[PDB]
Design a binder for these strands. Structure first.
Ligand SMILES: [Ca+2]
Ligand SMILES: [Zn+2]
Ligand SMILES: [Zn+2]
Ligand SMILES: [Zn+2]
Length: 90
DNA sequence: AGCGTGGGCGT
DNA sequence: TACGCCCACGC
């Protein structure tokens, strides 16, 4: 039970948000607006944070390293590493 | 497996 | 406002 006065008025959408920007971000799912552009491949994206991880597909940057002993696996995204770590154990 | 992308939060 | 982090789901 929170204060989320920013309601999405799109048809049949009953989502609400705590700050105006989070609502505007969500609304791009309805409109398909993609304000951000990768300058390497020209692809456009709805979100700068998703643009940022996309660009690691060009640079090869892999900031997330497996902690398992003798494993040298690295990943671009933290969720990729979570999935890998779940694999060592089961 | 690698990564688009939606929603939850943050400084 | 800018600019994310993490998680989850779905190809
Ligand atoms: Ca509504
Ligand atoms: Zn909506
Ligand atoms: Zn690109
Ligand atoms: Zn590993």
């Amino acid at each position: 039970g929170s204060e989320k006065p920013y309601q999405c008025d799109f048809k049949d959408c009953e989502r609400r948000f705590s700050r105006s920007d989070h609502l505007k971000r969500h609304q791009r799912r309805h409109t398909g607006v993609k304000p951000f552009q990768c300058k390497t491949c020209q692809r456009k994206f709805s979100r700068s944070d998703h643009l940022k991880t996309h660009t690691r597909t060009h640079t090869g940057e892999k900031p997330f390293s497996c902690r398992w002993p003798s494993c040298q696996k690295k990943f671009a995204r933290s969720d990729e590493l979570v999935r890998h770590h779940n694999m060592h154990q089961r």
